[PDB]
Write an enzyme that holds these catalytic residues in place. Sequence first.
Site, PDB file in Angstrom:
ATOM      1  N   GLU A   1      -4.193  -9.129  -2.325  1.00 59.99           N
ATOM      2  CA  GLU A   1      -4.942  -7.861  -2.282  1.00 59.99           C
ATOM      3  C   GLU A   1      -6.401  -8.206  -2.145  1.00 59.99           C
ATOM      4  OE1 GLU A   1      -5.129  -6.037  -6.726  1.00 59.99           O
ATOM      5  OE2 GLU A   1      -3.109  -6.539  -5.983  1.00 59.99           O
TER       6      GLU A   1
ATOM      7  N   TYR B   1       1.871   2.966  -3.059  1.00 64.01           N
ATOM      8  CA  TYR B   1       0.873   3.879  -3.690  1.00 64.01           C
ATOM      9  C   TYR B   1       0.828   5.270  -3.086  1.00 64.01           C
ATOM     10  CZ  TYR B   1      -0.419   0.086  -6.602  1.00 64.01           C
ATOM     11  OH  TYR B   1      -0.373  -0.954  -7.496  1.00 64.01           O
TER      12      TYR B   1
ATOM     13  N   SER C   1       0.827  -1.211   0.000  1.00 63.90           N
ATOM     14  CA  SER C   1       0.000   0.000   0.000  1.00 63.90           C
ATOM     15  C   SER C   1       0.851   1.246   0.000  1.00 63.90           C
ATOM     16  CB  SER C   1      -0.950   0.018   1.215  1.00 63.90           C
ATOM     17  OG  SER C   1      -1.989  -0.918   1.063  1.00 63.90           O
TER      18      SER C   1
HETATM   19  N1  LIG Z   1      -3.868   1.648  -2.690  1.00 60.84           N
HETATM   20  C1  LIG Z   1      -3.496   0.555  -2.039  1.00 60.84           C
HETATM   21  O1  LIG Z   1      -3.087   0.587  -0.874  1.00 60.84           O
HETATM   22  C2  LIG Z   1      -3.622  -0.762  -2.816  1.00 60.84           C
HETATM   23  C3  LIG Z   1      -3.797  -1.970  -2.147  1.00 60.84           C
HETATM   24  C4  LIG Z   1      -3.894  -3.145  -2.901  1.00 60.84           C
HETATM   25  C5  LIG Z   1      -3.808  -3.158  -4.283  1.00 60.84           C
HETATM   26  C6  LIG Z   1      -3.647  -1.948  -4.931  1.00 60.84           C
HETATM   27  N2  LIG Z   1      -3.587  -1.873  -6.266  1.00 60.84           N
HETATM   28  C7  LIG Z   1      -3.578  -0.763  -4.201  1.00 60.84           C
END
Ligand SMILES: NC(=O)c1cccc(N)c1
Length: 353
Positions: free
Chosen positions: A332, A250, A247
């Site tokens: 996820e 991101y 996370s």
């Molecule tokens: N924004 C995030 O913390 C997150 C978590 C799991 C998968 C993705 N793509 C993003």
Amino acid sequence: LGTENLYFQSMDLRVQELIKLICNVQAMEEMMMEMKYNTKKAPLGKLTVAQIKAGYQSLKKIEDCIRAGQHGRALMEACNEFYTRIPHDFGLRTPPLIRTQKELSEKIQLLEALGDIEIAIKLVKTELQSPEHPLDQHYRNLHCALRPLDHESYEFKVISQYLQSTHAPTHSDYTMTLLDLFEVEKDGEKEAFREDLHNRMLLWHGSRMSNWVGILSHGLRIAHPEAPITGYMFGKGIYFADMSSKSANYCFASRLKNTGLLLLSEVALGQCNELLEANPKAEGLLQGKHSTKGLGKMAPSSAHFVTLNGSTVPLGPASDTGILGYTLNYNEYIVYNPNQVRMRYLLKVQFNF
Ligand SMILES: NC(=O)c1cccc(N)c1
């Protein structure tokens, strides 16, 4: 400053610093310039929701071209029109085609940030003759309680362990230092939440610094309806990790801007539909199940789990899940209704590169 805060009984200083940080519009400007958005040609103060929706529509047209195998003139036409709606700064070079899932996703992330910035700029507007401090005005408009937690508390210790113990081995370009911790109580979430569902886990979510005013004021939201479905590995849900650094990636922090935030939320997973590879159409596969779980090769194990106020905390370290085309490194989790989420903690994190 500490004494001055007590006499005026202003907002807690830690909360003041948090609000100043997330509401910093100059930082949003710099962040968007970094993403190649042309803030000179189209200032953020003039950004409208209709402009952003038009952007998504052009991305959908691009997706249509890619799907039909039009990779020459029609694709360069469609990319140029997106670029007219959402002006970019490519200097003197040919504006590049958007051809891959990755490239499309990058543009979606740009529009997601712009959407949160549109929200922030409205929210931060002040009544000039008001007796309220501007920070109090911003805070109230969040409709979201933020309460600093004691660093000698059990909650702080467990969350610190969660952060460190689930920092993934493949995310070794940084470590994280927990600078501060806030309890989050978003108006309406406690009553809306799917308390009835089983498999309630405390899970991570990271986002760019430009997005927190939107996130705290509106809650975590599913993707825009006009956004390209191919932008989303498991469709238009709210995405969470059990590995802090998945996370944290991101956050898009860097050596230049090394402070980011991480969110912990109680997530009502219910019965997960478990998937091994990407499927943007995953939401249609639930057939009554409540969440999609993208299965990773490495994950925390139940031996090390603790419970925090009725949600499971999947403490690390991660180990082999026995699960194995290409396969996710880490789990996820996706829920498709915001009533499966109750935001709970906001971590202020220092990234050490
Ligand atoms: N924004 C995030 O913390 C997150 C978590 C799991 C998968 C993705 N793509 C993003």
